[PDB]
Design a protein around this ligand. Sequence first.
Ligand SMILES: NC(=O)c1ccccc1N
Ligand SMILES: NC(=O)c1ccccc1N
Lengths: 208, 208
Amino acid sequence: EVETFAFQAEIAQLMSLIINTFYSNKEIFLRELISNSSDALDKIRYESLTDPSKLDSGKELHINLIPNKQDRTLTIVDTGIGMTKADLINNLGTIAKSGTKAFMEALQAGADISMIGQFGVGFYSAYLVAEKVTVITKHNDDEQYAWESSAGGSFTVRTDTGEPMGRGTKVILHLKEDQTEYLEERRIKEIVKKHSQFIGYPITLFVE
Amino acid sequence: EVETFAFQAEIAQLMSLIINTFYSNKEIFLRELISNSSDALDKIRYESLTDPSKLDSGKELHINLIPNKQDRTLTIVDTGIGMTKADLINNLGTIAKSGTKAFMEALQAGADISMIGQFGVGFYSAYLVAEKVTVITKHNDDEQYAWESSAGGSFTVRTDTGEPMGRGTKVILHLKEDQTEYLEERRIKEIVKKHSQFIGYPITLFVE
Ligand SMILES: NC(=O)c1ccccc1N
Ligand SMILES: NC(=O)c1ccccc1N
């Protein structure tokens, strides 16, 4: 039981902009995804300050970066607040319709694609390097779900029955045939040091 | 009926760091406060995407910058999600205890105070220029309240019975005797153009 959904017109436009525009500095995708994980972890930290039982589903708050050369994937895993089903459908908790409008209109005024995260749609930058993204998420108020898309104008949402993860979100990036450098230990270290070295949560680089 | 509260030790430490450290680039305070307003407006936009009645208390989403030379104040007003009383008490909706720890430890590694907003405690930068900050806030799930402090280690929270504002938050900065340049039309234009020209909500500069 997979359900299919059409992206809203503005989002479908953003994604094909992201895919089609010649932009060489693709490496920012990782920063924009580490940010999202950082915000997710902010949100559960807060929520527990008044209710320590929200942490029943995992006391530890971190980010993992898991490269895998066999499947050509890099996964960003975090133990943050996760997303409910309704959230996944509503542009994965972002305000993407109006954030795309503000983004499109910043590009009218000399912005580059690296400013994507200033408008709340940083997530889409995963398409700078991924031909297909899978978001496995679990929130305390709901079950585990997998969101998926290869762009094209539509996304899928099914309940995930695989590996119960407890609480958080897992962005699997099925990388493009020529972006396999984002699976290098060396290269990921460089990017994380360069673009998010003062993120307030431990990031672990898994090895293969 | 004012209630007084002691800041948590880490927050009280951050604020006196902010007050006492020689740092010349005080102008970033404004960016960090425009951000907060921007995030507040993000949050109510989202909330209405599934329930358009949250906007019953104001359909328009903007930021205003109101300088006033007579009282030596600059106010940042927004029609975002506002804060409940519990929020105001819990460090004004931030995660300031652990965000201060991450901030303190970034300064251990060559961060400057301008990176305050990367740790979620940007709000405190208002003390770069303000001897006293007053936060008047209204959220849909609660009444209108005023939070206040001149540092010293304590803050006050009372119900505000003055100007019912509908929905949003209002940071009144009672400026320091020698930071009156942040009341200049000229100077605020320069700062807003320089540091937040791609913020996704209209900012209006009131005139006097
Ligand atoms: N790390 C996350 O929870 C996340 C991932 C993709 C989009 C939005 C998100 N909030
Ligand atoms: N603009 C606001 O709603 C706001 C102000 C100060 C601190 C936190 C906030 N979320």
